[PDB]
Design an enzyme around this catalytic site. Structure first.
Site, PDB file in Angstrom:
ATOM      1  N   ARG B 350       0.819  -1.208   0.000  1.00 47.64           N
ATOM      2  CA  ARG B 350       0.000   0.000   0.000  1.00 47.64           C
ATOM      3  C   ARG B 350       0.854   1.260   0.000  1.00 47.64           C
ATOM      4  O   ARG B 350       0.484   2.264  -0.620  1.00 47.64           O
ATOM      5  CB  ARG B 350      -0.941  -0.020   1.200  1.00 47.64           C
TER       6      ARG B 350
HETATM    7  N1  ADP Z   1     -10.591   1.291  -4.541  1.00 52.11           N
HETATM    8  C1  ADP Z   1      -9.451   0.313  -4.557  1.00 52.11           C
HETATM    9  N2  ADP Z   1      -8.784   0.073  -5.686  1.00 52.11           N
HETATM   10  C2  ADP Z   1      -7.761  -0.805  -5.710  1.00 52.11           C
HETATM   11  N3  ADP Z   1      -7.378  -1.458  -4.649  1.00 52.11           N
HETATM   12  C3  ADP Z   1      -7.991  -1.274  -3.483  1.00 52.11           C
HETATM   13  C4  ADP Z   1      -9.097  -0.334  -3.424  1.00 52.11           C
HETATM   14  N4  ADP Z   1      -9.524  -0.351  -2.137  1.00 52.11           N
HETATM   15  C5  ADP Z   1      -8.753  -1.221  -1.464  1.00 52.11           C
HETATM   16  N5  ADP Z   1      -7.899  -1.712  -2.285  1.00 52.11           N
HETATM   17  C6  ADP Z   1      -6.921  -2.687  -1.864  1.00 52.11           C
HETATM   18  O1  ADP Z   1      -7.055  -2.899  -0.389  1.00 52.11           O
HETATM   19  C7  ADP Z   1      -5.729  -2.426   0.186  1.00 52.11           C
HETATM   20  C8  ADP Z   1      -5.976  -1.499   1.298  1.00 52.11           C
HETATM   21  O2  ADP Z   1      -7.295  -1.696   1.776  1.00 52.11           O
HETATM   22  P1  ADP Z   1      -7.591  -1.319   3.384  1.00 52.11           P
HETATM   23  O3  ADP Z   1      -8.865  -0.439   3.486  1.00 52.11           O
HETATM   24  O4  ADP Z   1      -6.379  -0.545   3.944  1.00 52.11           O
HETATM   25  O5  ADP Z   1      -7.812  -2.719   4.242  1.00 52.11           O
HETATM   26  P2  ADP Z   1      -8.385  -2.757   5.774  1.00 52.11           P
HETATM   27  O6  ADP Z   1      -9.864  -3.161   5.731  1.00 52.11           O
HETATM   28  O7  ADP Z   1      -7.613  -3.751   6.581  1.00 52.11           O
HETATM   29  O8  ADP Z   1      -8.245  -1.396   6.393  1.00 52.11           O
HETATM   30  C9  ADP Z   1      -5.008  -1.727  -0.871  1.00 52.11           C
HETATM   31  O9  ADP Z   1      -3.594  -2.078  -0.801  1.00 52.11           O
HETATM   32  C10 ADP Z   1      -5.559  -2.200  -2.132  1.00 52.11           C
HETATM   33  O10 ADP Z   1      -4.753  -3.311  -2.617  1.00 52.11           O
END
Ligand code: ADP
Ligand code: ATP
Ligand code: MG
Ligand code: MG
Lengths: 466, 477, 187, 81, 456, 128, 128
Positions: B350
């Site tokens: 990320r």
């Molecule tokens: N709109 C998006 N487009 C592409 N990838 C996404 C998108 N949303 C989430 N991701 C993927 O999910 C990862 C981060 O999601 P995140 O919200 O941080 O997870 P968590 O629910 O643990 O907080 C990113 O590294 C990405 O790979």
């Protein structure tokens, strides 16, 4: 009153007062500490002894150490002087800009609004995300919950809602980080500084930040949600504003309760959770509500342990929310983003008398065709695609096209995908889904709908395919 | 005396109840008369429950227990570099005593919001797949997750070896000091790994903390924190540190044992309620410090073993929710010969795309997009797409213990994504790449040096690279 | 610290405090003294005034232990008895005191060799046969014992006698006789 | 759920051995369309077999979860005394 | 030190000592019994009381019975005089042949070797078995999971491994029968007596047996593996050999540990296994390793509960397994002996950095040709038939006549070294013997004997 | 008694599951720590020390014999339960009966594929 | 009240799963012995002595009635849990709602296969 420490078990401290036993929920100060250590009273154990939950680390505590009763619950400074700052659970500024010179302090424990205060207005809140606006539209003042396992896109979705809603917002805004990554808090602080929302040089900031993160002991993670609630409650009651409250993550509140309940000497319930899970969650979530003296629009991320959507914590939270958006890993692993599950997200304004009969018919048609495709999944998997009916092949093609179209690129997800973030108005979404349902695009490849904006960009990409 | 001394009332279940110690602090390191050490966990109105950092056999009832007066700490500093220590900082490699002069509490807290800054500097793993599609920056927490025998420890060792090209240079701002914490692995494995690092000459800047499978569960539960403190030392002094917890599943198992021998309510899969905090407070201490705090950083590479490729388990999902990405090592991919078997479709970083260099980004954005197309397809163009994707996946395969400099990797990925391999046989791409790298390190030291120094691919360098790879390809089979 | 265990053991917190005091007295030779002062302090703690005061669950532990220390120190207690009292008090085990004392009493009931034995028969006996019976059941004993007869009368055994001496138990009553007769004539 | 998992796994076993029978029948009738039916049913049987392996993994996971949950119930009911 | 039994609950005995408590894991002799009953200490309960698990049944124990502390863990008699004998968890001869007249004893509870005593390079153990040495080599000092049960020639493979390791490497073997059916224990004893592995008449026996059977209290079934490991540890440290240690079965060792914990009242973990499952297995397995004196190579029969490999017991023993040997029944029906499955048998030293690029290349070639042979047999051309011919000759060449069976078929014993195995499979893959008949490789030694039989 | 004094006996426990249930109740009422399915920690010890007494002696001891035929009543083919798994691990085979065979006309409803004898051929006359 | 004065009432508990959860909290906090899913031992009593108060009186008691419509929330369609089975075994027939039928356009998503009314046709008008 002055007591002494008689037991230290992890984050739970039993202290024995001589005279002046403090009531429950009071804050106590430990004497002999470099930094402030607050203990909140949870029980009266009898024999002039009380049990307490520490608000910070408990190392270095010795049996016999002094403790002073403050005579009140944990009080945090509230007011407009808290905007553009960062405070921890007990209200100390942790942004290294000096003390918060506000006029008044409020307690983090308060009673939920009564019944005659409840407001029932249900105007829609257009976010600009196609799947959310189509199938589970949000409402002003309602409560939104973003369910999802680990790494499915809850934080990205909250950052997108802060980009689309907290920027064009008229009232104030609070963000309470409850047990999440600290680097995410740093990135949010700086991304809000740069965008002018937090203004460090004058008094025109439009956001207050509270932060107890996953490095904090379970007491801080259990009460930082209440601190954020207190700030939002001041901005709602004492100023009649329209507040936004982003909580991330609210499952950590229940999980911290679970981490402390083992030591508080209680018989475990189901899945090891505390017996008081539902009532704790209720006395927390009932304060997060839009009264008729104000409005609080709440967006709460909700973790889901081991992707189990029947775990007691999310299964209990479901009843507290006006609109739920359930991200799914089976969908995120298809490449679709946002990973919203279109057959598990619901909303209380998905009613033809509210969103209009047209929006309702479109949403129901999308859900129905996706459900039929989900039913066909097993046949398609085993007996191949070429043993279906012609109408069934039509529905499969349309449903895959709708699956691709429900995805959308985000302005905050460009950093690691490159694509430009789109914001699709409600009319464009309704129109595009009407057109895909009517079959007006059964000649383009489904791959044309993956990661686009409105339907115009879909047909533009379909032409670019040649 | 019952204030700086105690008597063991009851030993068993890895916990020693001690009578006395009216002056002991919570989480204080007491010392048993057996030579062992322990942590004062529970302070109760009449007794003290002490976690024993070793074998209960060495302790009888009635043994006198002296207190050290210090919270559990480990010796830190640069005197640890090149030493193999146990979870308590004691040398187990027979090379004398650790000449450390500073100690650090293992149970410290992670830096808050203000002391941090976004990840900006690259952490070169030396692996084409990682550096190209899963970039890792200094200050990140990247999870290496996969089944048993899929290549996790090998990835970590390749990274530690790759840091050698920086740890011999000049500027102290690119050097990286590595720490490898071993939690419940076979001890022969750790000895062979230490030898492998000694051969590659990567021990002069590496520490190895080993709480192996034959050590008590408290040692396996404490070793990650000893490692993380040895890394916080470098982080808090403007230096840069990498740390690999290999692995966290076995520390979670050790903590579950310690929690069940203490009779605490088991949760999902019989894990304690706080098996998340256990890891969170550990992986939050790997941070990138801003310049007002030194500019240092600490990178963590936690390892997680999944059962039957199941990633939606309890502990795997916990660590996925703590870290800043993951590196999916599949076993089917590892079977078909793809090594490193990185599922580039599920692997993600990320906060790494802001850490790639300019040249690696120039080639890797392209590469990622063509690989995405190749993966989603699996016409007249889609055949070209599948051919290019097959060539690129064959280009991602890599040897072992041979990490590549960033200029060599960007050169190879350039030769790959610019189409110059669209006619060669897939099964020959490997030898083509090997010979190509030999040629370029022989006759193109200046192009490599200027791609390195510039950190970017200028149009002069782009043209030089084009005609160079075409001259080599024409003179090939 | 090595402990000297009494010949018979009592359990629970009662027996634990009883054996603690037994060893603490046999290590400095005050068994008889602490025994009589224990029975007297049990009489003191059972007078309705302090007997009521001592169980009230809100009376502070420090204030109550100092009140009881005041009240016991006037009888010219030796340090061991007031030590036991203060331990039971600051440990909150005062309501058990008399029980402990009882245990301790029975403790001494074995140090003097007092063997309790019951000889129960149909109807009360006259003490000529009872004396020759004292002789008869004193006959089985070893060197250096004293016996305690507690005979009770029940016509439910309709004859004979039952000698329950410690753990030895002979049932010469006609009840067991007729039950044996019936079980034999049926089998 | 253990029982619903057994339900779905028995469904897939049913149709799997059905396509096995139909494949071998169409291979008997192979002495054009019949050969295509033979290969298509072979592929359908291999698909159903891989689905059976997936469901077996899920079933073993759910079985372990059920045993652990019942043990937790037993020990937490016994430990309250 | 003399204490007394204060409580008896099944197999758990609480013993109170007046002075001088014994450390945990010591052995205590219950005084005044017809047969020796040893209690092993597990906890210090307080009030000078200890809790113990009994190594034998506890019928006829009375409260207050005297117990003598031995001042050391369960000490078994070790030495070459143990070879050919059978002993139980506490080292008593249960073969009815008199005492085991050794010179020294050893405690079964020891620590794993230090970090400075490990060997830094992995090296192959040459077993003289062509399929084992080619496709799934055994690491000297590593653990090998031996799969497959009845009717696949498992005990024959065990006896042949014993014989080959004794002849080639000069190192003896130990056999720990954890959780044995007594019928199968006796059957194996007699099969070892026949095949010359055990010799009841001279001093030339190759294996030492240790048995804890299915009908003993869980403490005995848990500690019998440590007893066998202690015998093997003596052979490694004081003799300087390359010992073998067979463990049948290891799942029953895990089960004995689980039962022992459940008796002590410890809260159970996941799937019911003891909370200390991983550390039990670790403190057992971390003694089986290579040192600067000798080595111990462990072959362990793996049982998979409910044919689930994610179960905690296999998943925990798999972390320590360096190789795998799968005996299939289909490979046995095809007349291949040893019936080792060639594709499912894996290894962790099948690595050119360890076995060298030559061995790895030949082994990968054999694996590839056999896989493509199965792919072709799916169908039943130009060179497909050439691969089929070479693969049939490979299958035939994998078989081998075991010396431990000379008494049955009369054929000689073949201990094919690694060099000749490598070279033979290299020549069969190079096509040098494409003209010989496929039956000219069935039950042969090196390739020279294959061409010799091809003459006839 | 017969087995040790030179004669040949045969014993049928019908059935062992209910003896296990009785032991479970006994152990729960004696305040012993339950294990899986609430059975005590040593029900395997129970059944294995019961079954290992069924032996076949030699001519130096009398040549006697004692065949055991333990019975187990499962619930819907659940041989993966606790007590069925134990008794299957202890015994020398099994004879699996079925309700589907009992309805589809096979009586005795012996399932030939699942049933097995680990001694097998050694326990037959030459004609059979 | 209405039932005992000739009037007819209709009560709807929404829902009883949350009442059972509240009672479970009260029990586990009062240190009462937990059962399945840590529920107390007598939660069946808790729901039965409530749902049995729904009766149809005869004309000697006014003729009034009291209809009950208890509501129950299952977790992923698991009607084999403790409280769902309790309340199913107490009541006079269920009204099963599914989410797959709810998204297939069937609203109200009543699963007619699993819905029973033990009263049946006696609770209908003639025409219907
Ligand atoms: N709109 C998006 N487009 C592409 N990838 C996404 C998108 N949303 C989430 N991701 C993927 O999910 C990862 C981060 O999601 P995140 O919200 O941080 O997870 P968590 O629910 O643990 O907080 C990113 O590294 C990405 O790979
Ligand atoms: N890129 C590679 N090229 C060649 N061999 C490789 C490669 N990666 C791994 N291997 C081999 O696969 C084997 C197992 O890999 P490795 O032990 O490093 O990963 P692991 O997940 O840590 O295994 P474990 O679960 O036992 O700890 C190693 O012997 C290694 O030689
Ligand atoms: Mg999140
Ligand atoms: Mg590893």
């Amino acid at each position: 009153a002055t007591g002494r420490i008689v037991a230290v078990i992890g984050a739970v401290v039993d202290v024995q007062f001589d005279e002046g036993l403090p009531p429950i929920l009071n804050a106590l100060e430990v004497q002999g500490r470099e930094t402030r250590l607050v203990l909140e009273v949870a029980q009266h154990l009898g024999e002039s002894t009380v049990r307490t939950i520490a608000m910070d680390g408990t190392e270095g505590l010795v049996r016999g150490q002094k403790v002073l009763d403050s005579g009140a619950p944990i009080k945090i400074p509230v007011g407009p002087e808290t905007l553009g700052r960062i405070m921890n659970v007990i209200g100390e500024p942790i942004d290294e800009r000096g003390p918060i010179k506000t006029k008044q302090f409020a307690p983090i424990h308060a009673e939920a609004p009564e019944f005659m205060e409840m407001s029932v207005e249900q105007e829609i809140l257009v976010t600009g995300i196609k799947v959310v606006d189509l199938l589970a539209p949000y409402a002003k003042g309602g409560k939104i919950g973003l369910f999802g396992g680990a790494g499915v896109g809850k934080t990205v979705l909250i950052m997108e809602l802060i980009n689309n809603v907290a920027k064009a917002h008229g009232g104030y805004s609070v963000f309470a980080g409850v047990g999440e990554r600290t680097r995410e808090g740093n990135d949010l602080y700086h991304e809000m500084i740069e965008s002018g929302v937090i203004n460090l040089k004058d008094a025109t900031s439009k956001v207050a930040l509270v932060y107890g993160q996953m490095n904090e002991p379970p007491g801080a993670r259990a009460r930082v949600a209440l601190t954020g609630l207190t700030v939002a409650e001041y901005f709602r009651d004492q100023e009649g504003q329209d507040v936004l409250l982003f909580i991330d993550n609210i499952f950590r509140f229940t999980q911290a309760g679970s981490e402390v309940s083992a030591l508080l000497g209680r018989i475990p319930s189901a899945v090891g959770y505390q017996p008081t899970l539902a009532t704790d969650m209720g006395t927390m979530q009932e304060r997060i509500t839009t009264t008729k003296k104000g409005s609080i629009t709440s967006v709460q991320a909700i973790y889901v342990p081991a992707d189990d959507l029947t775990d007691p914590a999310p299964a209990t939270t479901f009843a507290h929310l006006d609109a739920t958006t359930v991200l799914s890993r089976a969908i995120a692993e298809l490449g679709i983003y946002p990973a919203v599950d279109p057959l598990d997200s619901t909303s209380r304004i998905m009613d033809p008398n509210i969103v209009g009969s047209e929006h309702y018919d479109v949403a129901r048609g999308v859900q129905k065709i996706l459900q039929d495709y989900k039913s066909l999944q097993d046949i398609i998997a085993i007996l191949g695609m070429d043993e279906l009916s012609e109408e069934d092949k039509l529905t499969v093609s349309r449903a895959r096209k709708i699956q691709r179209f429900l995805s959308q690129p985000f302005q905050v997800a460009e950093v690691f995908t490159g694509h430009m973030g789109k914001l699709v108005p409600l009319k464009e979404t309704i129109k595009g889904f009407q057109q895909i349902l009517a079959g007006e695009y059964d000649h383009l490849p489904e791959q044309a709908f993956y990661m686009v904006g409105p339907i115009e960009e879909a047909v533009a990409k379909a032409d670019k395919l040649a | 005396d019952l204030e700086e001394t105690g008597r063991v009332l009851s030993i068993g279940d890895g916990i020693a109840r001690v009578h006395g110690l009216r002056n002991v602090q919570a989480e204080e390191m007491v010392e048993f008369s057996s030579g062992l050490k322990g942590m004062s966990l529970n302070l109760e109105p009449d007794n003290v429950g002490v976690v024993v950092f070793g074998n209960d056999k060495l302790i009888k009832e009635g043994d006198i227990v002296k207190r050290t007066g210090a919270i559990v700490d480990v010796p830190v500093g640069e005197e640890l570099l090149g030493r193999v220590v146990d979870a308590l900082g004691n040398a187990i490699d027979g090379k004398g005593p650790i000449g450390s002069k500073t100690r650090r509490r293992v149970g410290l807290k992670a830096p808050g919001i203000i002391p941090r800054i976004s990840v900006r500097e690259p952490m070169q793993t030396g692996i084409k797949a990682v550096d190209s599609l899963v970039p890792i920056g200094r200050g990140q927490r990247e999870l290496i997750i996969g089944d048993r025998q899929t290549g996790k420890t090998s990835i970590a060792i390749d990274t530690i070896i790759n840091q050698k090209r920086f740890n011999d240079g000049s500027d102290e701002k690119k050097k990286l000091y590595c720490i490898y914490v071993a939690i419940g692995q076979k001890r022969s494995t750790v000895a062979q790994l230490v030898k492998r690092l000694t051969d590659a000459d990567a021990m002069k800047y590496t520490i190895v903390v080993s709480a192996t499978a034959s050590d008590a569960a408290p040692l396996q539960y404490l070793a990650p924190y000893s490692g993380c403190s040895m890394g916080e030392y470098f982080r808090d002094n403007g230096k840069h540190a990498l740390i690999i917890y290999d692995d966290l599943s076995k520390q979670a198992v050790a903590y579950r044992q310690m929690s069940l021998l203490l009779r605490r309510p088991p949760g999902r899969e019989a894990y304690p309620g706080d098996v998340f905090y256990l890891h969170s407070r550990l992986l939050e201490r790997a941070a990138k410090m801003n310049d007002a705090f030194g500019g240092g950083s600490l990178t963590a590479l936690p390892v997680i073993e999944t059962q039957a490729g199941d990633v939606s388990a309890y502990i795997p999902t916990n660590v996925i929710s703590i870290t800043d990405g993951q590196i999916f090592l599949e076993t089917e991919l590892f079977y078909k010969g793809i090594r490193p078997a990185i599922n580039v479709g599920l692997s993600v970083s990320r906060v790494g795309s802001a850490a790639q260099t300019r040249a690696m980004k120039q080639v890797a954005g392209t590469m990622k997009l063509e690989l995405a197309q190749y993966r989603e397809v699996a016409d007249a163009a889609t055949q070209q797409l599948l051919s290019r994707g097959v060539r690129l996946t064959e280009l991602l395969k890599q040897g072992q213990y041979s990490p590549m400099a960033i200029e060599e990797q960007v050169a190879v990925i350039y030769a790959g994504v610019r189409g110059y391999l669209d006619k060669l046989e897939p099964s020959k791409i490997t030898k083509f790449e090997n010979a190509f790298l030999s040629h370029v390190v022989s006759q193109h030291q200046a192009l490599l040096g200027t791609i390195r120094a510039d950190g970017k691919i200028s149009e002069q360098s782009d043209a030089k690279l084009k005609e160079i790879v075409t001259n080599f390809l024409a003179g090939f089979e | 610290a090595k402990l000297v265990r009494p010949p018979v053991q009592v359990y629970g917190i009662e027996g634990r405090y009883a054996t603690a005091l037994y060893s603490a007295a046999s290590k400095q030779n005050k068994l008889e003294q602490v025994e009589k002062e224990l029975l007297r302090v049990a009489q003191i703690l059972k007078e309705p005034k302090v007997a009521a005061s001592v169980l009230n669950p809100y009376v502070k532990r420090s204030i109550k232990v100092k009140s009881l220390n005041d009240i016991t120190a006037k009888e010219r207690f030796s340090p061991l008895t007031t030590n036991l009292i203060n331990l039971l008090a600051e440990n909150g085990r005062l309501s058990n005191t008399q029980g402990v004392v009882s245990a301790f009493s029975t403790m001494m009931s074995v140090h003097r060799g007092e063997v309790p034995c019951t000889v129960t028969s149909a109807s009360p006996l006259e003490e000529a046969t009872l004396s020759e019976l004292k002789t008869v059941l004193k006959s089985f004993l070893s060197q250096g014992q004293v016996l305690k007869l507690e005979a009770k009368t029940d016509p439910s055994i309709l004859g004979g006698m039952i000698v329950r001496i410690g753990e030895k138990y002979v049932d010469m009553s006609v009840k067991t006789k007729i039950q044996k007769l019936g079980r034999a004539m049926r089998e | 759920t253990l029982k619903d998992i057994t339900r779905r796994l028995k469904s897939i076993k049913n149709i799997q051995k059905i396509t096995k029978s139909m494949k071998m029948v169409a291979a008997a009738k192979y002495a054009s369309e019949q050969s295509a039916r033979m290969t298509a049913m072979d592929n359908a049987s291999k698909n159903a077999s891989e689905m059976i392996d997936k469901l077996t993994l899920t079933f073993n996971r759910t079985r372990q979860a059920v045993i652990t949950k019942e043990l937790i119930e037993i020990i937490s009911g016994a430990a309250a005394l």
